[PDB]
Amino acid sequence: SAISCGETCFKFKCYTPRCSCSYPVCK
């Protein structure tokens, strides 16, 4: 994953290249 990850992700917070918000995880 990119820099805009390294955390949890509820709904659709992550939308950065190679940082998908796969509720509830950013990957």
Q: How was this structure determined?
A: NMR
Neighbours of 23 (CB within 10 A): 13
How far is the first Cα of the chain from the last one, in angstroms, to the nearest whole number? 5
Of the candidates 10, 12, 11, 15, which has an alpha carbon nearest to the alpha carbon of residue 2?
A: 15
Instruction: Determine contact, residues 19/1, Cβ cutoff 8 Å.
Output: yes
Q: Are 5 and 25 in contact (CB under 8 A)?
A: no
Q: How far is CA 21 from its chain centroid?
A: 4
What's the DSSP call for residue 7? S
Residue 1 contacts residue 21 (beta carbons within 8 Å): no
- Containing structural domain, residue 9: 1-27
Within 8 A by CB and 6+ apart from 22, the residues are 9
The identity of residue 27, as a single letter, is K
**For the chain, what is the domain count?**
1
